[PDB]
Amino acid sequence: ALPEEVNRTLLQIVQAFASNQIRSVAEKALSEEWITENNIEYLLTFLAEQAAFSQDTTVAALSAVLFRKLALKAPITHIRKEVLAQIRSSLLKGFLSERADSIRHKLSDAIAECVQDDLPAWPELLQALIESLKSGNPNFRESSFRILTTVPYLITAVDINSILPIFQSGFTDASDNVKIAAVTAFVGYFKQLPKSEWSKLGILLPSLLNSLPRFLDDGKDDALASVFESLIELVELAPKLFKDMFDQIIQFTDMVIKNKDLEPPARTTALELLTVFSENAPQMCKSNQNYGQTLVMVTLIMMTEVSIDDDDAAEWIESDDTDDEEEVTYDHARQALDRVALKLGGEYLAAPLFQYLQQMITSTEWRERFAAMMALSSAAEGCADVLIGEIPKILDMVIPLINDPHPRVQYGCCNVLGQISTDFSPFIQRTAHDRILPALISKLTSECTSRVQTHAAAALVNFSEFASKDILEPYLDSLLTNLLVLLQSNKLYVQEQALTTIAFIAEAAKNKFIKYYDTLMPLLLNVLKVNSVLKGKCMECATLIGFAVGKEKFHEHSQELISILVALQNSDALRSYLEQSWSRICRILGDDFVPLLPIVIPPLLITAKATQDVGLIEEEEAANFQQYPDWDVVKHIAIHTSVLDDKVSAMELLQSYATLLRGQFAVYVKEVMEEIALPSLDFYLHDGVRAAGATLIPILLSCLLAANEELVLLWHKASSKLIGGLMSEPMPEITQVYHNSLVNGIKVMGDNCLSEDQLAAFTKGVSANLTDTYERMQDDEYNEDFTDEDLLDEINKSIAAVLKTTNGHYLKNLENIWPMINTFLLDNEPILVIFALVVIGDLIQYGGEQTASMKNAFIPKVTECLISPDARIRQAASYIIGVCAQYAPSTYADVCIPTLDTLVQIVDGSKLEENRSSTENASAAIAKILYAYDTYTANWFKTLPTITDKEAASFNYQFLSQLIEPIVCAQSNISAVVDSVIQALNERSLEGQTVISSVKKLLGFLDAMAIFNRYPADIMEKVHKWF
């Protein structure tokens, strides 16, 4: 179908592809001469013909791959129909001919690029696919399923009564490959098509599940694991599809995991399938107690699979304190029980867990005593809600094992004590320190093996983190004397841990550590003056100690310590310890650090200026790059993540330096702003970099301010790029930071910091964020969002901040988004309602009584919201009613006092932590109506005190100050009057010196002192500094 002149040219080019001189003369010719609007048709026709008919493996394979790549970007839509027909028929004829397996796979991928909505129907393929699925050649059946995987719309095109038995045949096919293909294509259907199409194939799930036992019979464990991996994807998509046969799939995975003659992939995948149900259908897992029973049982079984053919754990005692990467099932079981526990809670999991725990701790199989410990460790956080009250029993179980004959069981017991010290904190620190500390300290002796000593030491880090200095003080000497011994170990990882443990004990001990400084600091210096990590940890310990004891004590060794830092710095995990130590020294020395900036900042400036580092890569070289954790890929794009992670790290340090040194950091602000902060916003392939750039902007500005054309110019530049990001930023979480960064920027720059160009572009940004938020939330048979509540919470802030800096002028610009706002107000979902209510509350403050245009548009919805079951909605509503009578008295007269009845009702589970906030706003709103325009004033009084909402408390008490300066004055409510004030002051909600001498006037008209006989010593001393 091609001129022989063209064939030989292109054949030379494609053959040239596998050979650099001959090679890229060819791909330059391909890229510049043949991928053109005049040659693309010829080029596609050629490659299709080569892949279909060439008997050279290489050329056929290459052409099929090239065709796939090129058919996309042409795109196939703009190809003349008569060549598309030519390309289709030849690909199809090549597919139905005699080809190698891999080539038919590539033919399949090529064919798939010739199927589309846009494109003319291709009934020849559909007919070809159906006859191919019935073939005796597995590769024909496999390739057909593969095509249906790429283009699952085709499953719709075929008559249902043909496609269904095809899949049922596929699930039970004699070939493993075909089966895996069938399962992949089946799940792929749900991956690509709308949910309204799912019920067409959903009925095939029991057929699939019934096919699974066959894999165990044939001993096909790896094919089973592949099928599990597809089923796991299906559980994330349509968990409820598994409802009716939940028991059998639960019992099947149980059966697979218990069969420990199988290779790990079958059993780890099986466990993941179990696990994933808890993450996608928890109500379903909870409604069936056979699930939890099975999940607990099998994870426990797998956690016993440690130190196989090594009962002494000799290999474990001799190795360092890292994980054995070979104990795969053990590790998988730990993470699994953790994930499920976090999803289902202790009310469901604790009982079946402890049924086994009771039993396993007593076994002679040390591996089961070990496994019991690790299992409790994994489930503790997620079962915390329950286990936090069963804490002496847990310790009664665990603590006796701390001297188990087997050192790996001891280790396990140290693990639990450490783990629950985190998960049950701070309550376990306050109530079990007399048991946990002596148990851990006892394992520090050189009687125990290195591994147990070290892990006991690690557990002490966990405990310390939430133990107050007063709790630790009587244990400090014992702790340290022991740790000093660990410090003299010949085993490096023991020393390293000892240092870290001392450090974080010191951090918790604070000024209680001062008496230990003299004994420790020399031992540290000797370590440093002599193994990179050791020094890094030793430098960390030294500076954490320094921060604990304070500047004065630290000054005894600071300059020597600094000189050693300098030596270490200018001589990869070490660099992180050093950077953090520098930053901690800055916290300690305060302003005295400033001469050290020329040493500390330039390394950071380099790392923080890192460019995004991205190489656009081919689809084959895609996974190839992602083996390494420091690289990720998402045309295809290879990003170097760690380089950008370190970019964020450096920016975070620059942040803290800027924050600590304030004005002393001004000299860097311009550079950091223009070269680092602002460019970071354009980093569209790394979320963290963008957020770090944003948070940096207000803190940079405050530095320069504290120490002007520069300041104003940089703010104009930074605000504009922030504002400009609101309409481009796809990530809602990042969007929130931008608004928050604008609030703080505005707060720094002050009054009228925005031009009305910016005020306009800000409004377009807000509307775009609101529009996209609405659509994302406007979205069951198959299935059972705080990120967006938070975004809307800061949009409230920025609008409020912008209103304040414009001193009202932004009312004009906000007019254009009220239809958006109004939609939100009436909407079902409380999140959108709360947002709107807060906005309207801010509007009236600057737009009362400018808002008569809006009055009857929101008040009908506001008055409903008053009685709403959601406290958040009542509060925001009560506030609006209140601010109506405060800033727009006469425009809202006909509304405020009719609602004065409802406020008196809502005002009375009201005085309770959950809704204490809501009822104080209503209390405030009542006080506002009473002020603006009399049984109500006495009703409002016993809503006092106001102790949570500060804005609300502020008004209520100088309404109280003005009511006197009737029912409040004289009388015998004088003890309730005073106490109403004392409570607000003491609770730090009340601004009140207005009211204090209003009270002092009343006490003069009397018995005066006896009113304070109620209050204890600590509150009385505050009273005396008050009156």
Binding site: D323, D331, R334, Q335, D338, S377, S378, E381, C414, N415, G418, Q419, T422, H455, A458, A459, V461, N462, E465, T500, F504
Partner: peptide, 5 residues
């Protein structure tokens, strides 16, 4: 210290 994987 002690963490979960």
């Amino acid at each position: 210290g002690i963490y979960k994987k």
